[PDB]
Structure 1
């Protein structure tokens, strides 16, 4: 056959890079041949794929091998796999076989990782076709894993000659001429499913990131393909980097299974479609188990702010560092992010522990910046404007793809996390009702379109509206000062109503603060804690499970009685007591106390009292 002496040279260099790499940071520069050690671990677990750092092979042999493979990855891949099999035979001959009946050949997936750079979706070019690259972006769509037919096998339906180890092209391929020279069967190739080996496969769609080419352009999208262990390796709707080769997808319909090339196809033309074949995938976007996940210094820092007793106030201060004032509102953020203990009673009734906050401020109150910080600083956080939004896009949508199927809405896109709702006032009343039922149920059911599916839809909602007429009439009542269905009002945990004040001192302070925010830009802000530090502490608190206390039971019952008397009930109901308990849970989580404290209930009582105004 074709010598491809360069190919076999690359094979040899690749096996020598896999076995004689002789590099290891463990025990300082002491060489372990980390690829030989990875082969040893491979024997321990008997996987298929081999993780290969691009930088390792780059330092290997001056990176000439890295360059060659990175360009002609497609051409070199069979040689690389053959060399990997040779290495396995050398050191892990057991793994050389799949490893009872006969064990077939084991396929090894060379999933290179840690590439030098990531090229953006628009950076993609035909020049890179077949070259190993890495692409970043969020996963807009995915596919159910399905068994691509890697190696095919067919029984000759005229002589029974069985074929095997037939690689398939994009279109389902079949043997052309019977291997049995005596036989002359050119069709009738009953696929031997048992003999043939199928690899797992999954289509995945991604879109351009916001700060990628935002300049006057719609975010470009790419169809990457997951194979082998990579399948399902990443969750949907998350920014991740995919390393692999650029694959050109010919139209199978043209293959037969502007114009296109022809005269091969034969008379038929052929139109292509570029795509990407991911080899390795990396995402970039218990209390004791969480601590284990943390680094030693990270655990120390955790303990450090745990020891701090002002920690509560400093955290509240850290919230929305750019935003000035409205400290109670920042406290509301913190508490909602912490959430509350969700529980289902013995009777089974589910009791939500989440907190759905609502904000009613005049324009320019920076509520927009408020939500921007919230979502940006919040995982599982979705931001949307009520004025421009569709119910299905917000909760869930039904689409037909070969065939009726479903598409997650904002609630799904952020279920079990923050749900920012900007311009809520402008939001459609019917859509508001859809959310109402969905959030109250903590569940979304797609009854329509024939299908009757249902999804968890559990999450927290940060409603953001403006008072009717762009201004809150203090003479009027919250219910009436803003257009919104009262029952949904009942299930909004909080209502931060933002008013204007002519306090000259406050005006001067805020003006100076803004002007500094522009002068010194980032230098102006200085929260007590870093956002990553804040998130680590927050998750640690999430790990906590507050427990109610006898004194707390009492304090709660008297405080609820006092609230009922205060309204004496347009805004005071059993829902208010439920929110009181949830706020107590959130405060304890901020206090990182497994038990509730009447002080915590006092804080929550003051919070709700202020919300009442």
Structure 2
């Protein structure tokens, strides 16, 4: 029945939730949502078993009705508490509910006819979703014949001064990469969202989802919506924009910050299976942290982030490292074969020139690629541009919407003949220097021989490659632990501090770069044959990154001797 539910059960349910400690309610939560305009509420799905043993097993079967008996109970229990006296219910207001659980996730490949008009739980991934048009509830579907001398046959004028308005967003879902796409490609699905959950999910994230598989019109169509979404914890599966982090988390964080044995701890963090290569690694982690995007009263929106390089003989674990940098806030990865054009296609509906837009998708994330080498030049010029001004322009048809995106970039490579070029002269790149110039890092890889190193890289790998070893003994090391922390920690540290230099750093850095350029020019003159602003404006970013690390705003050049001794590697690499 419609009323025996609202008559007592839902209406007293919220009223009855009782554990001493005088918290265990959804009443106070409802009011402290109400006060601040939120208009929502969350529940589990296995608390009702703590109230009864039937209603839940009715919630699954006829959800669409129960989830409005809830709304009626919600407002009729909440407007009593709106009343300070009968004189401050200015007017009532509508709410939306959320429910959650921890039961079990599913996969798209089992969404079939039996799992229809029924609650579920899944786990997928996102690509993109629509804009925000509209939808409403009532105003003053079939609109029948009668009129209300004659007035004939359906003369109905909508009075939209007297209509209403809620939201509408149409979310999307693709599967995960480990549920038999092997002999296939991945399918996907489109969705639906209602009132307060637009701008709750940007594309490119891992989801938990609570939804329902229902139709619109025997070949008729699918779709799904949210029935109280939540999110993922792949380490920190969804910790990408919002904050349910608590003072405990800030406390643990900043207590880690002042701990002055964190950076040399973090130079051993990425590889619980690889040996060595530490000076290569001291600034693969700073690349995430980023420096400062300082605009000024003139134009100079100077380059914020940093950029990476590496090229070397195979056999030194390039691929795993870059896959790991993808793994550990948000990022994507391709390598070669992909663009120079952007996406001016045309929805066959309405025949216009829309802009679908994927350096877009790293506007706070980053990007990593291998093979700038083995992808030719028809698609390098748009990326020549993007990574120096970030004002990604468009001028194709009658649109000049030079949008922008702030992304960094990481580059692997492969040179011909190994260190054949790297011993002799000008075959470092085969193509051009202005994407070798326009970067920051300059880190070459070699695989030189020595018997001690040989035997050690022998047994070091065996204990790694023996029987999925690292259950016990990885975290028992000092502090080389928990990428999940690194995700949430970065998404703090980048989004708070506004650091910049001291006085004493400036003169020392100027003199040092002066000596660097002078040494380059002397190599020009000491060989009778043949230094940007970019090098200064990049190495400053490592000071930026370090001060980002320890959370000190102002940093020193003695703090940055490490950074300039990292750049020393670049200098003595391109020594010739």
Structure 2 equivalent of residue 364 of structure 1: 315
Corresponding residue for 1:136? 123
- Given that 1:222 and 1:275 are in contact with CA atoms closer than 8 Å, whether structure 2 keeps it comes out as yes
Instruction: State the Cα distance separating 1:73 from its structure 2 match.
Output: 1.0
Equivalence map 1:33-52=2 (5 Å): 34-41=25-32, 43-45=34-36, 48-52=39-43
Pairing 1:322–2:273 present:
yes
Deviation digits for residues 250-298 of structure 1 (CA, Å, limit 9, x no counterpart)? 2xxxxxxxxx3xxxxxxxxxx411111213233323xxxx9x9754554
Q: Does the CA-based 8 Å contact 1:15-1:86 persist in structure 2?
A: no
Q: Distance in 2 between matches of 1:86 and 1:610?
A: 70
Kept in 2, the 8 Å contact 1:319–1:333? The answer is no
Shift of 1:462: 0.9
Q: Equivalent residue for 1:429?
A: 377
Q: Which has the higher helix share?
A: 1
Residue of 495, 498, 504 corresponding to 1:551: 504
Match in the other structure for 1:333 = 284
Q: What is the 5 A alignment of 1:194-205?
A: 194-205=161-172
Written as runs of structure 1 = structure 2, the 5 A alignment for 1:499-518 is 499-518=446-465
Asked whether the 8 Å contact 1:361–1:472 carries over to 2, the reply is: no
The size of the alignment, in residue pairs, is 549
Task: Classify the secondary structure of the residue corresponding to 2:60.
Answer: helix
Q: Return the match for 1:382 from 309, 312, 332.
A: 332
- CA displacement 1:318-350 (0-9 Å, x = unmatched): 134333322122112122122222222443211
Gap regions ≥5 residues in structure 1? 154-163, 165-172, 251-259, 261-270
Question: In structure 2, how many angstroms separate the alpha carbons of the residues matched to 1:611 and 1:35?
Answer: 60
Report if aligned partners of 2:303, 2:389 keep a CA contact under 8 Å in 1.
Answer: no
Mapped contact 1:51–1:111 kept (Cα < 8 A): yes
Q: Which one of the candidate residues 588, 601, 610 is aligned to 2:547?
A: 588
Equivalence for 1:465: 413
Normalised to the residue count of structure 1, the TM-score between the two structures is 0.81
Q: Distance in 2 between matches of 1:421 and 1:529?
A: 26
State the distance in 2 between where 1:114 and 1:419 align. 34
d(CA) in 2 for partners of 1:14, 1:446 = 59
d(CA) in 1 for partners of 2:45 and 2:109?
Answer: 23
Task: Give the deviation of 1:68 after TM superposition.
Answer: 0.9
TM-score when normalising by structure 2: 0.85
Query: Which one of the candidate residues 147, 156, 172 is aligned to 2:134?
Result: 147
Report deviation, 1:545: 3.9
Pick which of 503-512 and 583-592 moved more.
583-592
Deviation at 1:45, TM superposition (A): 4.2
Q: Distance in 2 between matches of 1:22 and 1:531?
A: 38
Cα distance, 1:575 vs. partner?
A: 1.7
| Superposition deviation, residue 502 in structure 1 | 0.9
2:145 equivalent to 1:177: yes
Deviations 1:24-76 (A, max 9, x none): 5xx54x465x23334433553465444333232343212x2112111211344
TM-fit CA distance, 1:525: 4.7
| Equivalent position of 2:17 in the other structure | 22
Ranges in structure 2 where 5+ consecutive residues have no aligned partner: 525-529
CA distance 1:179–1:72, change in 2 (3 Å)? farther
Q: 1:279 to 1:552 in 2, by over 3 A?
A: same
Out of 439, 442, 448, the position equivalent to 1:495 is 442
1:600 and 2:554 matched? no
Higher strand share: 1
Q: Distance in 1 between matches of 2:99 and 2:354?
A: 34
